[PDB]
């Protein structure tokens, strides 16, 4: 079971505020501290602050500007970080982590990708990428899917709902005119496709949209 | 873990003068340092414990000093038997650690090699092989070159050389040059020559034997 | 009697509460070391015994108040346990 | 605040050989150092706690060593799944701090 | 009576056993200093007296448990020896 | 008396394991620790681990890979180090040492030379090296012996069972085609040889072979 559960993404207008959540499962103790860590893309881990839910005290990193306020709900077992008056410098992945009061972070959440921008949320368009009519066949075949025109990051691309994990490459998104585009490739023995089925799944949490797309040969 | 730095790695002295080995710990360790001597092919032997305390059976020329991070092993008047590697070791914190060691070498008066050549033995010959062995012994300095001649012609194949470290008895060096041939090719040639050139003589010091 | 047992329980309560409250008071102060519960429990023991290893100390006002409560109650209760053990020992001295 | 220096920032090795990551603290912190692995797009995952203690579910190729100011994370025989960033983290003094990370490449 | 003699013996036993077990518990922990028997014996004395020089301390869990046993038994027995010496002294106070 | 006694050599196939022994004599105390130190040729001393025989706990160097397991037999007063799954990086001299629990190594064993290789054990051939028929005589004479074609290291060469110690040089072995060769020289007053006797003794412990060879002038 995922012990710490976080929303996938939040989009915030410049100067606005957002409230991130972190729902906890598993073993719970009064010695538990919940921490928050900020990671800008291509950067390292940055400690933000901590809260002890069984009492309600929070502490904050003093080397950085205090743009966060920590709370906790003991009923829902959920910690909250309020980020206030956000600039583009606050666009980052925000992890929560549980520490049993002994100094290390045993478990981490998946992180909430926070994007600070004025642009509008846009769900993606998923297109099938099957080989052309005259592509020679090897012992393997490479299929793919195109995820075009979405905002903000991220998207999660799976193949056959996770059962097809090996032979998968999902490329980093490229931004053009305020919308992202990426593609993902999968490579499967050519003798099995399309005798079985190969389907891509694309999750865009900022728009709560999930799409499946079957890759069938050309008719 | 305590890092023990021994610098310099090599210490070159003249005989009879005082020499000092340095051991520096990455943090303060009181007096919890101990010194060991290891001669060539030998086991380490404890010289000084707890930075300065003498050990029974160790010559009084050895003493130690220091506390905190800087420690010194001292030999008041070095003799040839002191040629060895020297290791420091700390016991202040777990785990125990050793320094990387300092080699002591002695600068002595120049000495020409004592050259001897040895023909193959009958026991070896009755087995299908023949080795001509040449000893270049008790010279100084260690730089030396050996040359093998058969019937006046220099040969270089089948010649394996070996050098000893500095000698703990007289501070010299020695070398062995061995030319290995089959019995059938040991026969077919009369003159075998070991030549060897050293800075002690402008002319080489030649030893030779004819199968006659 | 079983007064030593009740004093022991009080001492253990003082140690645990002092550990928890010490971590609660010291986190948030830069340079503080009394910030994880195991070594805070060790520090509570050191405080109750006044053994004086000096490896851990509180640096905040509330951490030092917690230390004072652990000194008063912890030193008193540990003194009760120690007195009980001493009296029991001299009680064994009549045997021989 | 404890500064944790991870040098070098990039570690390039051939497959199967032993690799060592360095973490150096600006002052002595006993053994209160912990190591994390973060793969591309993944969350950090605890590898070693208190400088050398193993974690359940972590391959035995991982070990740690050190105390005071100098700490080492070691991988006995690196394979492709070890490609990631590696972070050290101290809990000796408030606040907790992270090193800047070392990238492993094969 | 000779209860002080029996308390002294118990104290010495506590000191020796605490030295041996402290070295046994602390070796294997990087940075540990309680790893040779002479200074472990010194540390046992420091613990029993609570003199607090703070030059030596255990860093492992079992070393700290050993320290706690040396605190309980060592502080109790040393308190018995000290009480005996005090009573003997005031016993000498009647002479003058 | 030699207080710590170790086998001279052990040859191990790659990926195999070996159990080194260290028999203790002299004074024994419960405060005694037995340590093991590894020394690769031309390198320094490397602490491996320790064991307290009067209880059975062992500790190991954590900066290196744990390729050893320490045990002790209180009856035979013998400590054992099990080296497992050996590579060629484990080929070295392995010393045991006794520490009285006060931090220093008062006594050391002679060391066990451990060679990791697939080659086979081979005893040496010892040949006499006496001067030729027409070698001029000085006040001293130099004799020697040839130790050819053995594996693995080491060999121990004595002269007259140790009574002839001064004037002796034993050269480092040279390896060719998976077998070692060395020679040893001795220098004695020429007036005494061969009026007394000069004999070389060659011990190869990996094959448990010991050989004596008399050096007699040519007939
Ligand atoms: C909520 C308040 C209660 C706190 C509960 C404390 C539980 C104690 C067990 C912790 C084990 C930590 C292991 C570790 O990885 O740390 C080791 C580092 O080498 C050494 O650990 C320690 O030093 C433990 C110190 C506690 C000793 C006090 C004994 C006196 C009764
Ligand atoms: C098995 C458990 C029993 C342990 C037995 C301990 C024997 C004590 C004698 C050790 C002498 C070491 C000499 C040395 O080279 O060290 C000196 C360094 O300058 C200082 O030594 C010391 O500081 C000794 C400390 C012990 C003092 C405690 C006295 C209280 C009764
Ligand atoms: C009365 C005992 C001291 C109270 C401890 C307060 C801990 C929280 C301080 O922020
Ligand atoms: C009960 C007193 C503590 C026991 C000491 C154990 C020492 C060995 C730990 O590895
Ligand atoms: K008391
Ligand atoms: K005190
Ligand atoms: K008292």
PDB file of C-alpha atoms in Angstrom, chain B residues 1 34 36 38 41-46 49-50 87 89-91 94-96 98-100 114 116-121 123-124 127 131 133 135-138 160-164 167 169 172 174-176 178 180, chain F residues 35 37 39 43-47 50 59-60 62-63 95 99 102-106 108-111 127-132 142-144 146 148 165-174 176 183-185 213 218:
ATOM      1  CA  UNK B   1      37.443   6.596  10.674  1.00  0.00           C
ATOM      2  CA  UNK B  34      51.567   2.768  18.182  1.00  0.00           C
ATOM      3  CA  UNK B  36      55.508  -1.037  14.004  1.00  0.00           C
ATOM      4  CA  UNK B  38      58.285  -4.558   9.099  1.00  0.00           C
ATOM      5  CA  UNK B  41      59.546 -10.718   4.086  1.00  0.00           C
ATOM      6  CA  UNK B  42      59.001 -10.280   7.838  1.00  0.00           C
ATOM      7  CA  UNK B  43      56.014  -9.793  10.094  1.00  0.00           C
ATOM      8  CA  UNK B  44      55.327  -6.400  11.691  1.00  0.00           C
ATOM      9  CA  UNK B  45      56.987  -5.934  15.075  1.00  0.00           C
ATOM     10  CA  UNK B  46      55.843  -3.490  17.740  1.00  0.00           C
ATOM     11  CA  UNK B  49      53.172   1.863  22.182  1.00  0.00           C
ATOM     12  CA  UNK B  50      51.055   4.818  23.332  1.00  0.00           C
ATOM     13  CA  UNK B  87      53.658   1.889  10.206  1.00  0.00           C
ATOM     14  CA  UNK B  89      48.404   2.700  14.183  1.00  0.00           C
ATOM     15  CA  UNK B  90      45.700   4.302  16.316  1.00  0.00           C
ATOM     16  CA  UNK B  91      43.414   2.772  18.937  1.00  0.00           C
ATOM     17  CA  UNK B  94      36.763   2.205  16.365  1.00  0.00           C
ATOM     18  CA  UNK B  95      37.909   0.915  14.007  1.00  0.00           C
ATOM     19  CA  UNK B  96      41.664   0.661  14.537  1.00  0.00           C
ATOM     20  CA  UNK B  98      47.008   2.018  10.109  1.00  0.00           C
ATOM     21  CA  UNK B  99      49.046   4.662   8.376  1.00  0.00           C
ATOM     22  CA  UNK B 100      50.238   4.035   4.837  1.00  0.00           C
ATOM     23  CA  UNK B 114      80.916  -9.140  -6.393  1.00  0.00           C
ATOM     24  CA  UNK B 116      79.988 -14.837  -9.802  1.00  0.00           C
ATOM     25  CA  UNK B 117      78.834 -16.998 -12.708  1.00  0.00           C
ATOM     26  CA  UNK B 118      77.521 -20.541 -12.310  1.00  0.00           C
ATOM     27  CA  UNK B 119      77.198 -23.181 -15.058  1.00  0.00           C
ATOM     28  CA  UNK B 120      74.171 -25.497 -15.119  1.00  0.00           C
ATOM     29  CA  UNK B 121      74.287 -28.374 -12.667  1.00  0.00           C
ATOM     30  CA  UNK B 123      71.118 -32.682 -11.905  1.00  0.00           C
ATOM     31  CA  UNK B 124      69.384 -30.033 -14.015  1.00  0.00           C
ATOM     32  CA  UNK B 127      66.330 -33.296 -16.903  1.00  0.00           C
ATOM     33  CA  UNK B 131      70.154 -22.398 -16.550  1.00  0.00           C
ATOM     34  CA  UNK B 133      72.990 -18.122 -13.137  1.00  0.00           C
ATOM     35  CA  UNK B 135      74.958 -13.129  -9.039  1.00  0.00           C
ATOM     36  CA  UNK B 136      75.701  -9.396  -8.755  1.00  0.00           C
ATOM     37  CA  UNK B 137      75.962  -9.001  -5.003  1.00  0.00           C
ATOM     38  CA  UNK B 138      76.554  -6.291  -2.396  1.00  0.00           C
ATOM     39  CA  UNK B 160      65.111 -13.274 -16.256  1.00  0.00           C
ATOM     40  CA  UNK B 161      66.393 -10.745 -13.720  1.00  0.00           C
ATOM     41  CA  UNK B 162      65.625 -10.256 -10.033  1.00  0.00           C
ATOM     42  CA  UNK B 163      66.580  -7.478  -7.605  1.00  0.00           C
ATOM     43  CA  UNK B 164      66.578  -7.502  -3.819  1.00  0.00           C
ATOM     44  CA  UNK B 167      70.072  -5.142   2.569  1.00  0.00           C
ATOM     45  CA  UNK B 169      73.005  -6.081   7.006  1.00  0.00           C
ATOM     46  CA  UNK B 172      73.794  -2.720  -0.320  1.00  0.00           C
ATOM     47  CA  UNK B 174      72.080  -7.501  -5.046  1.00  0.00           C
ATOM     48  CA  UNK B 175      70.767  -8.844  -8.347  1.00  0.00           C
ATOM     49  CA  UNK B 176      70.434 -12.260  -9.997  1.00  0.00           C
ATOM     50  CA  UNK B 178      69.419 -16.210 -15.001  1.00  0.00           C
ATOM     51  CA  UNK B 180      67.492 -20.476 -19.254  1.00  0.00           C
TER      52      UNK B 180
ATOM     53  CA  UNK F  35      42.740  -9.511  14.743  1.00  0.00           C
ATOM     54  CA  UNK F  37      45.312  -7.946   8.741  1.00  0.00           C
ATOM     55  CA  UNK F  39      48.666  -7.078   3.024  1.00  0.00           C
ATOM     56  CA  UNK F  43      51.085  -2.459  -0.273  1.00  0.00           C
ATOM     57  CA  UNK F  44      50.409  -1.481   3.328  1.00  0.00           C
ATOM     58  CA  UNK F  45      48.530  -3.087   6.198  1.00  0.00           C
ATOM     59  CA  UNK F  46      44.738  -3.345   5.982  1.00  0.00           C
ATOM     60  CA  UNK F  47      42.645  -4.102   9.064  1.00  0.00           C
ATOM     61  CA  UNK F  50      38.553  -8.834  15.161  1.00  0.00           C
ATOM     62  CA  UNK F  59      33.610  -7.052  14.126  1.00  0.00           C
ATOM     63  CA  UNK F  60      34.563  -6.253  10.551  1.00  0.00           C
ATOM     64  CA  UNK F  62      33.069  -1.609   6.937  1.00  0.00           C
ATOM     65  CA  UNK F  63      35.091   0.405   4.400  1.00  0.00           C
ATOM     66  CA  UNK F  95      48.355 -12.019   9.373  1.00  0.00           C
ATOM     67  CA  UNK F  99      45.762  -7.599  21.244  1.00  0.00           C
ATOM     68  CA  UNK F 102      44.622  -2.311  25.244  1.00  0.00           C
ATOM     69  CA  UNK F 103      44.818  -1.209  21.613  1.00  0.00           C
ATOM     70  CA  UNK F 104      48.132  -2.513  20.226  1.00  0.00           C
ATOM     71  CA  UNK F 105      49.272  -5.728  18.532  1.00  0.00           C
ATOM     72  CA  UNK F 106      51.998  -7.141  20.757  1.00  0.00           C
ATOM     73  CA  UNK F 108      51.917 -11.258  15.089  1.00  0.00           C
ATOM     74  CA  UNK F 109      51.761 -14.511  13.204  1.00  0.00           C
ATOM     75  CA  UNK F 110      54.088 -15.182  10.298  1.00  0.00           C
ATOM     76  CA  UNK F 111      51.222 -14.759   7.837  1.00  0.00           C
ATOM     77  CA  UNK F 127      69.725 -27.408  -8.196  1.00  0.00           C
ATOM     78  CA  UNK F 128      73.228 -26.866  -6.774  1.00  0.00           C
ATOM     79  CA  UNK F 129      75.202 -23.794  -7.856  1.00  0.00           C
ATOM     80  CA  UNK F 130      78.943 -24.457  -7.288  1.00  0.00           C
ATOM     81  CA  UNK F 131      81.789 -22.600  -9.045  1.00  0.00           C
ATOM     82  CA  UNK F 132      83.162 -23.772 -12.356  1.00  0.00           C
ATOM     83  CA  UNK F 142      80.035 -17.632  -3.171  1.00  0.00           C
ATOM     84  CA  UNK F 143      77.788 -20.678  -3.575  1.00  0.00           C
ATOM     85  CA  UNK F 144      74.091 -20.839  -4.292  1.00  0.00           C
ATOM     86  CA  UNK F 146      68.391 -22.658  -7.863  1.00  0.00           C
ATOM     87  CA  UNK F 148      62.883 -23.508 -10.313  1.00  0.00           C
ATOM     88  CA  UNK F 165      72.504 -16.618   8.315  1.00  0.00           C
ATOM     89  CA  UNK F 166      75.024 -13.898   7.456  1.00  0.00           C
ATOM     90  CA  UNK F 167      76.165 -13.541   3.863  1.00  0.00           C
ATOM     91  CA  UNK F 168      72.857 -14.820   2.447  1.00  0.00           C
ATOM     92  CA  UNK F 169      70.743 -13.254  -0.316  1.00  0.00           C
ATOM     93  CA  UNK F 170      67.445 -14.773  -1.431  1.00  0.00           C
ATOM     94  CA  UNK F 171      66.132 -13.062  -4.540  1.00  0.00           C
ATOM     95  CA  UNK F 172      62.455 -12.332  -5.207  1.00  0.00           C
ATOM     96  CA  UNK F 173      60.722 -14.960  -7.303  1.00  0.00           C
ATOM     97  CA  UNK F 174      60.059 -14.284 -10.983  1.00  0.00           C
ATOM     98  CA  UNK F 176      56.990 -17.278 -16.053  1.00  0.00           C
ATOM     99  CA  UNK F 183      67.815 -18.426  -6.497  1.00  0.00           C
ATOM    100  CA  UNK F 184      69.665 -17.916  -3.232  1.00  0.00           C
ATOM    101  CA  UNK F 185      73.342 -17.121  -2.657  1.00  0.00           C
ATOM    102  CA  UNK F 213      70.587 -29.891  -1.266  1.00  0.00           C
ATOM    103  CA  UNK F 218      82.777 -30.408  -9.174  1.00  0.00           C
TER     104      UNK F 218
END
